[PDB]
């Protein structure tokens, strides 16, 4: 038997089989419902589109994300997402496959409890397990120490690990991510004349962000460069023509990661929460952590983010340390890759939570040594 590695994320579902080199199914975690009335009789419209289909019918739907910041807020939508993943994308029967699921640090406990209750009762999986995203990133990176910065789409977090032991008191979690960057980019494009308001235009703005945004190495110098030159402006082609041209908005959007006061948050940038997690860690492992700073997740994928973060952390740390930032090209899928590695490990086969254990001890079994 083989296991299923479903990294449900928050804004992208990634599923596949344990032992693969990459996820087989990657689609947005979206549930769309029609908002107009529907006149053609006989074509038999359905009531909810889930996944990559909702992006095709995007023009006549209201797109909902069932998961807000790591946390699941709509359990019916999430059951639809999982059903679509199991049956219409992987085409497997979950009654005969263990399932490894992934979660961010410092979430509510009812999240995991309801997740496993659903997986055992609605889908009847034989076993299941919930892993932390950062640990799986560090598996897939081929390290055993290092401070991992996993910037997804709802949540950003640092998890310092040394020699296979994690330092829980030094785990930092920040609720600024790609979704807030998209909202800031909408709000900041509005000052050039373009307005995107609907949930179906949020997707167009997310595409603009992915395709044109980058991190400036020096924010003030890039601002002056954009104010004087015009060599920074790119054009983008909306899905109906009418090209839009954006200038300093390209590097002004992901700069919110380093100055979260742009969106009215009080906290510190990612370069500073990384350093603060390191300084919470014990003094004997800080050199290794400085040398093994691992990036993963979709929001770490801007051009120039590694160079920017190295410049910042280097200016912060003592001048006699080797700051080094590991940013693989397959960053976005690191959590899934590590999950596949972990579920294929042979030592792991007695760490699943079986159906018998669940029927014995209730959903509370999730927080036990079978974590």
């Amino acid at each position: 038997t083989t296991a299923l590695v479903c990294d449900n994320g928050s804004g992208l579902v990634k599923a596949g089989f344990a032992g693969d080199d990459a996820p087989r199914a990657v689609f947005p975690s979206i549930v769309g419902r029609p908002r107009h009335q529907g006149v053609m009789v006989g074509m038999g419209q359905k009531d909810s589109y889930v996944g990559d289909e909702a992006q095709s019918k995007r023009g006549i739907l209201t797109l909902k994300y069932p998961i807000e910041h790591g946390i699941i807020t709509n359990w019916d939508d999430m059951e639809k997402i999982w059903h679509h993943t199991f049956y219409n994308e992987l085409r497997v029967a979950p009654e005969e496959h263990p399932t490894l699921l992934t979660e961010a640090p410092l979430n509510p406990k009812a999240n995991r409890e309801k997740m496993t209750q659903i997986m055992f009762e609605t889908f009847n999986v034989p076993a299941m397990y919930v892993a932390i995203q950062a640990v799986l990133s560090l598996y897939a990176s081929g390290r055993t120490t290092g401070i991992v910065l996993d910037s997804g789409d709802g949540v950003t977090h640092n998890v310092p690990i040394y020699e296979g032991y994690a330092l829980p008191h030094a785990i930092m979690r920040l609720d600024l991510a790609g979704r807030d960057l998209t909202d800031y980019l909408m709000k900041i494009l509005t000052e050039r004349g373009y307005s995107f308001v609907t949930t179906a235009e949020r997707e167009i703005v997310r595409d603009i962000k992915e395709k044109l945004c980058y991190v400036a190495l020096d924010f003030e110098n890039e601002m002056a460069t954009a104010a004087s030159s015009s060599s920074l402006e790119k054009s983008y082609e909306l899905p109906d023509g009418q090209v839009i041209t954006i200038g300093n908005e390209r590097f002004r959007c992901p700069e919110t990661l380093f100055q979260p006061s742009f969106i009215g948050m009080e906290s510190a940038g990612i370069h500073e929460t990384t350093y603060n997690s390191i300084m919470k860690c014990d003094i004997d492992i800080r050199k290794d952590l400085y040398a093994n700073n691992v990036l993963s997740g979709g929001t770490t994928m801007y051009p120039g983010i590694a160079d920017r973060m190295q410049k910042e952390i280097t200016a912060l740390a003592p001048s006699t340390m080797k700051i080094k930032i590991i940013a693989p090209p397959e960053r976005k899928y690191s959590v899934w890759i590590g999950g596949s590695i972990l579920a294929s490990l042979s030592t792991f086969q007695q760490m699943w939570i079986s159906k018998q254990e669940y029927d014995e001890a209730g959903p509370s079994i999730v927080h036990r040594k079978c974590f």
Binding site: L217, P303, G304, D307, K311
Partner: protein
Amino acid sequence: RAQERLATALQKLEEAEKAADESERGMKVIESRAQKDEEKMEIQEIQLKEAKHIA
């Protein structure tokens, strides 16, 4: 045919611009590395002269 070759030339322009701007970013991070190198150099040469004089 005219539209086809238009689109192909466009996508090639896109690829070339990607490569060129990435090279620009690389050369900028390199020249910054070089100035940081040079300032570390002056500092370490100065502590070298100090160490040699005191020795």
